[PDB]
Every structure is written in structure tokens, then in C-alpha cells.
RNA sequence: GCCCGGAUAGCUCAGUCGGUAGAGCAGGGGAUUGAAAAUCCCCGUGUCCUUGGUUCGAUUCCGAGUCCGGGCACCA
RNA sequence: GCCCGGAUAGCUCAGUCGGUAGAGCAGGGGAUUGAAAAUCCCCGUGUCCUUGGUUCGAUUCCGAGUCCGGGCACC
RNA sequence: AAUGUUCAAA
RNA sequence: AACUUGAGUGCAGAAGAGGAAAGUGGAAUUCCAUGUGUAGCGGUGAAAUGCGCAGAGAUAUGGAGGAACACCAGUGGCGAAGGCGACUUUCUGGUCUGUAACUGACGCUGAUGUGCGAAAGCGUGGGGAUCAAACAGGAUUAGAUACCCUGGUAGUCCACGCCGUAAACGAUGAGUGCUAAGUGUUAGGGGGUGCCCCUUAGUGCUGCAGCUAACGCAUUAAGCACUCCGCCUGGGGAGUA
């Protein structure tokens, strides 16, 4: 529980979800719009981010770590508002990675909307 | 208007209460163009705040707007193909001229019998707080400042 | 004829270990907008089941009490 | 020839365990709006199947009664 | 990214 | 009888997602395994059905299994047409350029037959990861069998065998000669100095002459000539009896 921090996070057009974890996969925090009263589509704004990565930084408690490293999956509204806003708990972002899973012709997607 | 910016142009002296200020809720009490009838009522109406709150009713005035003083508006503005509302801050100017309808509004309101003193008991108990009106600034005060929404709105 | 659970906003649940009452559905009034439904504010009354006692004080502990859910039920 | 279910706004159902009648579809009049349909208010009459009795009181319990649905039906 | 039907006779 | 320009065979080189048969790899979806963790994920205009403390979704590792091959990729290439795009090997068709050594008209078009022929469908097999008719559940409207969402069977996948249709579309049959010019691009071949102009073959645009009802086509003709085959003769009734 000592000092140590990856952040990941993904923003789809629902429930733009953070979770930041150790050097493993050990699930310190996690937190959501959906913990919080969001569900008319304010699921997802900027301000559901504003108080996203607050609400799962500050809710360290055993860690407050040195940096974030966050890995940024979701391809969504709720990117920079959540990784600005993340510095608000004081946490000094220092690198940024951004990993979204694109295919490569693998399986054939649903069909468009009307 | 489609065309922009009407002049304002609009004067508002006083005989000795020294307040531009002032005159303007003499300007909203006025109804059915008797002007013939306010001052000597809203006059009446100052001088029993002395008699009935614990000071002059200059140094109560500003205070007396100061707590009613509304802060935030919600115009509604159907966003780039959605529909729902935003805050906007008032511009100073009209943000006074938002603020002196709720004295007079529920001046008629408190039946307490005698409209010089039902509207002058809030001016009294609106330095001190939980008057009349001032419940409806707090609750138009958290219409969206709570409910924070797309603050990225144009209108 | 026997042991428990309790009657907790108009509906449903919560703590309710004597100084120490909460949520959500409903209702009303604004806003929306061609009109309703959604949707967003602002509000209130709860009942702490009848009643007495250990009571600085009982929604809270005993039992004079109504109703219903869990087991009764034996070789008459 | 036999045992039950009952005739509950003009249509369909509800409690109807003797003091103790409800909903929705329909109808009418406003509003809408170029005109109808939608859509929104505000309204009413029910029948508690014929009739007598236990009746402080029966839409409510018996049976003198009409109609129809459930089983009858045997060697 | 909508919830919107119809116009008796040439 | 001969000749060689039409078409063929030799010689050199040049490209190409042309096909059929094995083999290898990476990204991703889903479902199993276990860590950490706890109150929701997912969902739309808004919402619910569905999944969740019995331990979800987000995330760490690992396993299994099937489908398609992001970047290159482009009015790019190849095939008669449908079409074909990860990579390597085995077999194999077709066209282009230059060259002149042969053969000396051996060619064109095709009635009936003979074959190839997307997608759905059918038969006997296997395979089943995502999708996904019928259907089922939730909203929407007056009703919605629909558009929206959560699931889901056939099918979509491979071998063998049928069916033989489509806006199978440049809505433009096939062959051969001839009539202004610019302008990109692909595969070559010669001339002159990584660069500048000669012609052949495809493939895009802009444009006179000409035809055209007009839109527009215009060296890839819908122009000007010839040769052969297929087809139409007002619309409904009808691609039906
Ligand atoms: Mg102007
Ligand atoms: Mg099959
Ligand atoms: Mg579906
Ligand atoms: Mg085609
Ligand atoms: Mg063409
Ligand atoms: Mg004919």
C-alpha cells in the first residue's frame, strides 16, 4: 500500500469510469459517475470527470502516490477534464499513455443505427 | 430588436435621500401612473423603520438588497441540437433591476393589514435573514449552481 | 392453549442499545414546449399501534392489550 | 328432470360478509387550429333482474320466478 | 439523435 | 502459284490482391481459471427489461476456441465476367513491351449445345467467436406486428453436390480501319543530361470538329464506314395462365 500508482481510466459515452491500482492490478480506489447521482446523461460531462478523478485520487488514503501515469482507454468526452483535474488532489502527473484497443479486421462490428 | 442596443438613458434623481438608487422602487410601487401616492407612502414607510427595526433605514437599505441580491439566472438555450437549460451570471447592470420585484411582490403578500407597514417588513427582516423574499433567492440560488450542467453554452 | 417478529411521511423500507426521527415512490407550486409524457428546482405534514409503570427523560425496558407472518401439532 | 354462476352508467368489469355504489370506453359543452383526427378541462344520468318474507335497516340471506355459461348424460 | 395522421366531387 | 502488312510460333527482358493445395504469425471480441476490490455496470431523446454482494463492470496474469487480415492502399494493378488485399512454399493460366528468325491468311462473328457464374436458399457432413431473419422482454405512439434497447435460433465458416437468378450497370454487344489539342497516372522500350523529349499498351479529367430531343459523348465516341449475331413495336392485363 506504499507510495506506488497506475492510473486507468475509459470514457464511453456513459459512466466514464476511474481506477487508479499499484505496480499490479490492485484496485485501490475505484470510482465513477454512477457512485455519485449521474444518470440522465450527465453520466458523462466534463463535470462528471470534474468530480471523477477527485473522488478516486483523494480517496487514497494508504498510498497517496507520486505520480499517475495514467493509460487512457475509452475514446470519449471525459478525457482532459480528467486527467487536469486529477492534478487537483496533488498528485504530480508527469507522462501520459494513451491505449484504446483498435482491431485489426477482427470480429464484424454491429450494424448502424437508424 | 434585431437591431442592437436600445439606449438606456433612463435618469432617477431623489429629494433627500441622496440615492439614485432609491427612486427606482418608487418606480415599481407606482402603479396606474400615480406617482401622487408612493412617496408619501414609501416615505412613511422609511420613516417607521427607525420606530420598529433597531436603526436608520439607509444603513439597513443596502444591506436590505445586499442579502435579497439574486446571483445566478437559468435562460434556457436548446444546445446544438439537445434541450436543456444553463447558468448564466448576471451582468451587474440588470442584476438590481432582476432584484427590487421581489420587494414589492410579496409587499403584497404579508397580511399584516396596512401596506405601509405589510411592505416595510421586508426591509426589516431582510438585513437580518429568512425574510420574505430572500426564501426565493436561495431558491433560484441553487437552481443550477448545484445543478451545474454544460457551462459551455453560448446564450 | 404455547414461544418470537413487529404496526416507523398518503406507499415502501432505515437507525430506533431512555436526553439523541432518515431515505426513496407519491402530492402541490414554478420552469421547459405547439399540448401532454418525460426532465429540473422548492416545499410540507410522519405514527414512531391502545394504555399504564422503572421514568432528569421511553420511537427505545416491562407487561394490563388488537391484528397478522415463523413454528406448534406429541402414543386422546 | 338435477346442482352452481349471476343479470352491477348507453358498453365492459369492481367491492357488493343488512346502516356503508367505484373505475375505464361512450355522450354533451368549452380550448387547441387553416378544417377534421388526435390532445386537455368540466359534467351527468347507473340497474344494483320480476316479487315477497328474517327486516333500526337487503345492491347484500331465503325462496314463489325469466334468461344464458359450467357439469348432466348411468346397464 | 424525434413525436407529429388526414383534406368529400371534376 | 507466290508475297506479306492480318493473326500465330521463336528470342530477350518487364511487371501482377489471376487461381488451386498445405504451413506460420500479430491486433481484437467472447467465454472459462485466480489475484485486488465494492456498489453498480450496461442502456438511450429520456427510461426500463437484462447482469450484480452468493463478490459484478473497471484490471493483473493465463488458458481455450473461431472469424477477418488495421498501417501500406492510391480515379493503383489483375481477370472474359462474378470478383480477388497478412506472410512463405508447391503446381498452373493469361496479357504487355522490344526484336525481327520462321509459318504464309492459318482470321472475324456465332443460331442450337457446351461451360464459369455475387448474396440468399436446399441435401449429407463437420464447425460455432462476433454478428444476426423468426421470435421473446422493455420503452414510443391512440394502436406499432416497426425504426430504439437487452437477449437470441437458422444462417454467416470449410469440404463435397445442387440451384443458375440481381440496378450480373459504363443501365452503352463483338471485331477492324480513320478525323484538333491539353492534362494527370501505371507497366515498359529507345534518344540526349539522379533530370529534358519520341512512340506502344492500358486508365482519369478538360476540351473543338461532328452527331444529339436535350442533358451531354467526344482517339477508352453516343463521330465517320463495313461484317455477323441478340432484342423491341403504346401502357395496364403480364414476365402471370
Ligand atoms: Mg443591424
Ligand atoms: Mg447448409
Ligand atoms: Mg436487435
Ligand atoms: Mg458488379
Ligand atoms: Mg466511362
Ligand atoms: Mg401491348
Known amino acids: 500500500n506504499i507510495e506506488n500508482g497506475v492510473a486507468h481510466i475509459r470514457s464511453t459515452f456513459n459512466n466514464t469510469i476511474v481506477t487508479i491500482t499499484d505496480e499490479f492490478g ?19 460531462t466534463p463535470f462528471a470527470a470534474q468530480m471523477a478523478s477527485e473522488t478516486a485520487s483523494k480517496s487514497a488514503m494508504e498510498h497517496g502516490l507520486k505520480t499517475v501515469e495514467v493509460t487512457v482507454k475509452g475514446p470519449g468526452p471525459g478525457r482532459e477534464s480528467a486527467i487536469r483535474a ?21 470480429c464484424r462490428p454491429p450494424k448502424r443505427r437508424r | 430588436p434585431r437591431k442592437g442596443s436600445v439606449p438606456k438613458r433612463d435618469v432617477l434623481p431623489d429629494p433627500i435621500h441622496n440615492s439614485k438608487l432609491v427612486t427606482k422602487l418608487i418606480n415599481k410601487i407606482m402603479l396606474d401612473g400615480k406617482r401622487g401616492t408612493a412617496q408619501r407612502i414609501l416615505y ?110 453560448r446564450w
Open chain 1, 86 to 106: 486529477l492534478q487537483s488532489a496533488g498528485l504530480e502527473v508527469t507522462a501520459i499513455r494513451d491505449v484504446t484497443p483498435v482491431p485489426h479486421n477482427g
Open chain 2, 44 to 153: 412613511s414607510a422609511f420613516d417607521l423603520v427607525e420606530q420598529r427595526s433597531g436603526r436608520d433605514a439607509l444603513e439597513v437599505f443596502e444591506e436590505a438588497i445586499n442579502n435579497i441580491m439574486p446571483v445566478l439566472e437559468v435562460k434556457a438555450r436548446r444546445v446544438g441540437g439537445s434541450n436543456y437549460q444553463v447558468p448564466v451570471e448576471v451582468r451587474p447592470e440588470r442584476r438590481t433591476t432582476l432584484g427590487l420585484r421581489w420587494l414589492v411582490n410579496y409587499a403584497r403578500l404579508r397580511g399584516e393589514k396596512t401596506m405601509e407597514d405589510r411592505l416595510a417588513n421586508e426591509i426589516l427582516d431582510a438585513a437580518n435573514n429568512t425574510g420574505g423574499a430572500v426564501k426565493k433567492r436561495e431558491d433560484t440560488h441553487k437552481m443550477a449552481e448545484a445543478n451545474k450542467a454544460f457551462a459551455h453554452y
Open chain 1, 26 to 44: 490492485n484496485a485501490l480506489s475505484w470510482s465513477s459517475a454512477g457512485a455519485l447521482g449521474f444518470k440522465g446523461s450527465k453520466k458523462s
